[PDB]
Every structure is written in C-alpha cells, then in structure tokens.
Structure 1
C-alpha cells in the first residue's frame, strides 16, 4: 500500500504524517497523537515553525467564531476554531471537511527542529476541547467517506531520524509477524486499556492490579515514555536497579533527568531486564503480555557533541495521571486501533526490537483464576 512508510520523526519528538489543509492545499507535517482528540495546526509565525496554516489563503476555510485552549502534560496552545478541507497525500485517497483549531499562541508545545507544525488527536470526542460536540478528525473521516472505522500504527524509531506507517481503514499484514492479540478498549475517551500484571526479568511486581491502572491506563503515541503511577514506578525502578546492579547509576538517571553514556558500540544491554506488561484479554481472566527490551526503554539521545559515546535517557517516568503506554512501548509493535470492535490489537512489527539473545514479543494466553477486576473505578 501507498500508506506504508508514511511517518517520520526525530527520536523523543513524536511521529508525524504529511497532511494538507485548505483549498488550494497547504502542506503541513502533523504529529500523530492517540493521546488527544483535537486537530490543531500552527497558524501564525513561531520561532520553531518552518511553515503554518494561512487561513486567508483558503477559500474553503469556515470560521466557527469560537476560541479553544488545550493544555497537555507540559505544553499548551490556544487558538480559534473553524473547519476546512483536509487530505492525507500518503493515506486514503479522500478529502474531508474537518474541524481545525488554528493555533495563534502556545507555550512549550512546538519543539525546535521536530519538523511538524500541528497535531492530529486520534482519540474520542469525549475528551475534545472545548467539549465533546467538537467532532474529532477521525470521526469526520469515517462519517464522510467509506473508510472502515480502524487505523493501525507501526512506529519504528529504528536507525535522530525515525519512520513508520499509519494505515487507515485496514490492517497491513506485511507490517507484522505472528498473531494479533486484542485488549478491550475499556471506555471510549482516551484509548483506555487495563494492565493486569507487570513483571521485570519475569519477576511479578506483586501489587493489587488496580494500582497499575490508577486511575486510567492509556495507549498514547503523543507521549514518549512509559509513564507509571508512583507506587508502580517506584516498585519497577527498584526491580530494574536490582537486575542491573553490576553497574550503579546516579539517581538523576532513574528520574529521567540525566543521561547515561558508554563508549560507542559498548552499551551493556544484557545487564538490563526485559519488562513485561500483561494486558486484559477479550475473555474473562485471560491476558496476553507485551515484552519490551532495554533497547526500547533506554532511549538514545543523538548529540554530535557526545558522539564518541552512545548516551541514553531512562524512558520510564512517574505519572500522577495514570499509566501511559507511550511511543517507547509502541515501537516495534504493530498496534491496531480497532474502533469498530472497541479493542486494540498488538503484534510484533516488521521493525521489531531484537538482539542476538532476546526479542520483543506479544504472546498469550495467560490465565488468572483470582477474580479481581483490575479497572480502577
């Protein structure tokens, strides 16, 4: 399909897809964000924008006469709502009319050299700003075209520059191997899921499973790290420390605020454990596990200045807002957002993570006869 390899990015800075807005079409790169539900594009000059949406140049622009403000984990923006024609040159061969927030002010949102100038929130209307009557893009796309109500993401961030695919309307079987395991979307707002068990080096963290979903867990392509509620993050760090205790790192490293560096080519991958996240299955008390390697959770930081070394930031961090399965954990899986059947599917992706000793995996089933719902509330 002409859709394969339509994502690009820089590591830690999100993955983006080419879109056009307006008529005649204005080309913009747009961040793919399953962690939010607003379509917003820079629409005035900013030191970090290479280009921006010029509403005056679009004869199909319609102004909704309504402001909007979106704060995310750290960045935020404000702008003006309207609608316009939108296309995805390397996606489905359609043009739809969609709501678009024209960002006119922002703080800590745009990133210097990221190459994107806007954001596609792919989650549900329940969390759109200003409220749930602002129809999200994907809903408009499905309503206006015959595109099936499903999209999949293969995020590779493999060899700063990263790639992948966003396949809309379909499952591309050349993008994964083995089977697809499905977890139910628990509620349609974020892509909310349920983690039932966490292991490090195969050792269970032995917590009540509701702690892992305090107070929701989501799948979030717009967030880099695996973020964990404090109690789970502390338990996990203790475990990973213990597994890797042949070397000691500063506390700043574990807090995500300092790099760790090894002379180029010598990163000791084998001293770090794998992490397994077990997700609720489609049948009662069954689960499957996705297993992640330290090549995924030690994120490389490209910097020519430090390049006699390879240097890494620890990409597991504390959350006061629930577990966030960010790009770290999506990378090397093919993740299918099957909105039509209210589930998300995971399979090992054609760009999987891989070492001569260990491989990321998606595998099941696992059973737990213990009858506790792991949903927080």
Structure 2
C-alpha cells in the first residue's frame, strides 16, 4: 500500500504545516501537524476542556463506531517550545492520503497549553519520530508510520514541504518526479528516538564550504533551523545590522536587508536554502525589525534541521531495519 497527502502552511510565514487525517467511522477529518520530532498522535476532542478549545475541529470518539477506549492508558507530552498536552487514549481507524491503519492509538486531549488553544488551525499532532518516544502509559503505543510499515510497498515516508506553498507527505514510495538530481542518503542514530544525523558542513551565501560535522535532527515539527552559535554568528555577520536580541528571543535583522543563502552538507552533496526562506518577517506588526530563520541551538542541547532547512529539500525518512535519511534538491 501507499498514501499521499498534501500538506499546507498554516500562515503566510510557514510557521507550521497541516495535513488532513481521517479518524474513525464515519470519517472525522482533522488537520494535524506531522511532526518527525515526536511520536504521539494526539487530537483536540470532545474531552478537551471547553475553555481550551478555540476554533479547532474536534474528534468525538462516541460518534465513531470503530473507536474503543484503551482502558487505563494516559498520555502527557511537553515539547521543546514549552507547550504541552495530556489526556486519555482510544484506538480507532486512521487514514492519511488513502493509507489506512486500523487500531491506531489516537490520544484524546483533556488538556492543552495556551499555544495550542491559540492556534485555531492545528487540530493535533501526528508524530513520526521513533515509537520509543511515545508517551502513552502504562503501555507505550506505536506511531502511524510504525503501524503502517509492514503494509507499505517500501518502508519509507517522504517530506516535500513547500516555501509559502503546499507540499506533500508520501508513505510507501519515493516519487522520482518530485526532486532533481539524485538522493543522497546518510546514516541515522535512533539512540535519542529522533531522525538524528550528521551534516558534513555549511556555507554562507557564495562563501567557501566549511567542512565540519554537525549532529542534529530532521524535525518537520520545528519551524526554524537551529545550529551551533559559531555557525549562526557566521551567517548573521553577513547581514548588515543583524544582531542577537535577548528581548526578542534571537537574531533579528533589518527588514530592508537581502538575506544570503545558507548551504548545508549531506555527505558530499549540498542543499541550498535560499535567503528568502530565512525571513520570518516583522517581530511585531509594523516593525522594521525582522526575525531570522536561522537561530542558535545553544541551550536546546541539540541542533534542529526544522522546516527552514527541510523545505529546501525532498527528504526521505527510510524506516528500513537500519534507518537512514535521504536528501535531494528540488
């Protein structure tokens, strides 16, 4: 089997992407944030504290003939950005782009933090990291991909995120029309539960490539590119007037600037992030200070190849017995 679904930016900045997911019988379609940095499929629901729902579409398990309470199971998750959610668990039928999993754990939120409430466009998350990170207790549950894997034509999924435009998540096949040149594959460590890999270096604009190992994660659920402070300083030094602002929370730059590209290495291959991908717009409405899309990972504890990086590539998440990651230009 295979699946193919379009993923759509939630706003004009590509802060996140939503993908429609069918849950239950008859189908209830919710727009979920596919997150290769976490491993829980959770949804706003009829159980979510009413004051914490503001415009989201909810899953109502009592209206699904295939929903079953997973007795005694609870979940609770905290994300890198400080947001969180928790609740109980149902199993139900879940379909993405025509690919169906029966008995998928659907984690129903009883509580969500303010950032979730305040974002009316995201109805929940669909985790695509390794199932070892799943938070369900006392019996850990499998991700949608882990459950689908054996049925897929090939044990892979691909992320093809758009810049200010829709893109695609495919399951079970590699669309050879969706990228240019070849796909370069690189080793993955699953030791921390992430799609963790080592970039071979970087360049700023038309500058020379610096060969240096940068360990980080491929994370579709993180907006920006978070890299070591040395790398990030070298980038922003090429933008007149750019500075790190503790009050704003990172590097800002004059909105009048033209940003240089940023290149990262994948083995001997190179992925180029155009400068415009690094512009996250005014820090507040009407400001002439703009927020940068490359930020320091210092104090995160890990480097993160988030959407800024991934949307410059066609990315293969290869879930073979020994997982790997592939990157192609597009």
Normalising by the smaller structure, the TM-score range is 0.7 to 0.9
Instruction: Report what 1:362 is aligned to.
Output: none
Instruction: Report what 1:291 is aligned to.
Output: 272
In the aligned structure 2, how far is the partner of 1:197 from the partner of 1:257?
A: 22
Deviation, structure 1 residue 318: 2.7
Instruction: Report what 2:241 is aligned to.
Output: 248
- Report the TM-score, using the length of structure 2 for normalisation: 0.85
| Contact 1:35 1:222 (8 Å CA) reproduced | yes
Structure 1 pair 170–253 and aligned structure 2 pair: CA distance change class (3 A) = farther
Instruction: Report what 1:199 is aligned to.
Output: 203
In the aligned structure 1, how far is the partner of 2:189 from the partner of 2:132?
A: 14
Instruction: Report what 1:171 is aligned to.
Output: 174
In the aligned structure 2, how far is the partner of 1:2 from the partner of 1:139?
A: 14
Show the 5 A alignment for 1:224-373: 224-228=223-227, 232-233=228-229, 235-244=230-239, 247-252=240-245, 256-257=249-250, 260=253, 262=255, 267-269=256-258, 272-279=259-266, 281=267, 287-300=268-281, 306=286, 312-319=290-297, 320-340=300-320, 342-349=323-330
Instruction: Report what 1:80 is aligned to.
Output: 88
Q: Gapped runs of 5+ residues in structure 1?
A: 282-286, 350-377
Instruction: Report what 1:183 is aligned to.
Output: 186
Q: Quick check: 120-129 or 48-57, which moved more?
A: 48-57
In the aligned structure 1, how far is the partner of 2:223 from the partner of 2:120?
A: 14
Structure 1 outlier segments of 4+, above 4 Å: 203-207, 253-261
- Report the TM-score, using the length of structure 1 for normalisation: 0.75
In the aligned structure 1, how far is the partner of 2:141 from the partner of 2:186?
A: 27
Instruction: Report what 1:9 is aligned to.
Output: 10
Structure 1 pair 109–37 and aligned structure 2 pair: CA distance change class (3 A) = farther
In the aligned structure 2, how far is the partner of 1:254 from the partner of 1:346?
A: 36
Match status 1:101 vs 2:79: no
In the aligned structure 2, how far is the partner of 1:206 from the partner of 1:194?
A: 12
In the aligned structure 2, how far is the partner of 1:94 from the partner of 1:324?
A: 30
Deviations 1:171-194 (A, max 9, x none): 112221111111111226211101
Deviations 1:141-173 (A, max 9, x none): 224x34421111111132xxx411111111112
Q: Gapped runs of 5+ residues in structure 2?
A: none
> How large is the RMSD of aligned CA atoms in angstroms?
2.9
Match status 1:55 vs 2:50: no
In the aligned structure 2, how far is the partner of 1:153 from the partner of 1:206?
A: 26
Structure 1 pair 71–249 and aligned structure 2 pair: CA distance change class (3 A) = same
Would you say how many aligned residue pairs link Structure 1 and Structure 2? 316
- Partner SS for 2:221: coil
Deviation, structure 1 residue 111: 5.6
